[PDB]
Amino acid sequence: GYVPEDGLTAQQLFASADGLTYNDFLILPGFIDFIADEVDLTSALTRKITLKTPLISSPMDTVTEADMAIAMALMGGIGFIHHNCTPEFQANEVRKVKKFEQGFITDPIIARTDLKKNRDYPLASKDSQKQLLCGAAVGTREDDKYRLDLLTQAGVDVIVLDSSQGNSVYQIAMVHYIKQKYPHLQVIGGNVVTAAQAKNLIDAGVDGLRVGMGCGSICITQEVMACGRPQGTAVYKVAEYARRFGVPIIADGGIQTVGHVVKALALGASTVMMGSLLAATTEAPKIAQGVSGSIQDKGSIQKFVPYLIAGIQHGCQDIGARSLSVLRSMMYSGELKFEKRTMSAQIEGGVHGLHSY
């Protein structure tokens, strides 16, 4: 009645200072004793918001403009309104997000079409009354403090502070300002990749952290600047540290299939920012450290996100985890076991042996 324990526990992957990303490892399967589609996907975007689906849409002008934020909230995720735009435009934009369905309408009462929407979209993320949740990016420059006023009067729930570095005196100063002036506004950090720099943002009072820098599909920062972290290592090594204080970690960049979503959610992160996978769907709109564009068409979101939700929850089922909180327990108790891959051992992931596919 004894059987050896195959594979590294989570801490034993990252005990070698080796720089793994999501491609470099696998999760060992475990005992299925539950039906394929009853696992619970609720995850925290900050200490005080739960989303009924862990998928976030990245604050960039190519992805979330006016309608991605609507759909992601109907689908129990969220969006962050971009900010390479005039502040009045962005504020009007989050306003036309918040008003899309309502409980007690204050500045047009109730309605019946809104209740039909409530019946049709059961996962929808709704704050209070019945309106949709929405976030936005705000910059770090001094003149962007004006934008907070328009956003606040426009009913935004949460904000990211956008900059490629989170551990700067300016971003900390901005977190202090927001947290002393607008105590109902939850704020989210700036692309951290190490526990020693997540500390300063946590002490400032940041209510959730997005993690990863210079790893991404449209993003060239590492290969032009030297700073970065292999983002599958980053998401574990910082969520190990942020879990002590309770702030959630949102995985950010390089997520280019469902497998990478499941790996990020097994390693510790609470939710995931999709960029270039959600870009070029139906409803998407002095040195240079970015890339121009060109993502191919990817259909309609309302038929796309359910595929992501079915894939992610099939992965959780076959790993053996009855919910995402159980998946993080199996991770931190050492019950999940992982295997490395040699470069060559990745090719038998369906890549070769066919004339076309």
Ligand X SMILES: O=c1[nH]cnc2c1ncn2[C@@H]1O[C@H](COP(=O)(O)O)[C@@H](O)[C@H]1O
Interface residues toward ligand NAD, by CB under 6 A: 32, 35-36, 58-60, 140-142, 162-165, 168, 170, 191, 317
Partner interacting with residue 118 (select from ligand NAD, a second copy, ligand X, none; CB below 5-8 Å by kind) = none
Give the active site residue among 134, 215, 219, 316.
219
Minimum CB separation of residue 253 from ligand X in Å reads 3
Q: Is 219 a catalytic residue?
A: yes
Contact 261, 239 (CB under 8 A): no
27 binds, among ligand X, ligand NAD, a second copy, none (CB under 5 to 8 A by kind): a second copy
Q: Under DSSP, is residue 76 helix (H, G, I), strand (E, B) or coil?
A: coil
54 contacts 272 by C-beta, under 8 angstroms: yes
Q: Is 289 annotated as a binding residue?
A: yes
Long-range contacts of 10-15 (CB under 8 A, 24+ apart): 10/236, 10/267, 10/331, 10/332, 10/334, 10/336, 10/338, 11/334, 13/236, 13/338, 13/340, 14/233, 14/236, 14/237
Rounded to a whole number of angstroms, the minimum distance from the CB of residue 142 to ligand NAD is 5
Give the single-character DSSP code of 6: -
CB of 290 to a second copy, least distance (A): 8
d(CA 224, CA 239): 27
Q: How far apart are CA 178 and CA 155, in angstroms?
A: 15
Q: Which is nearer to ligand NAD, 10 or 151 (CB)?
A: 151
Min separation Cβ 214 and a second copy, Å: 7
The answer to the question of whether 166 is labelled as a binding residue is no
Comparing CB distances to a second copy, the nearer of 39 and 133 is 39
DSSP codes joined into one string, 188-200: E---B-SHHHHHH
Q: Is 253 annotated as belonging to a binding site?
A: yes
Note the residues at the interface with ligand X (CB under 6 A): 58, 60, 164, 191, 212, 216-219, 221, 252-255, 273-276, 289-290
Active site residues: 219
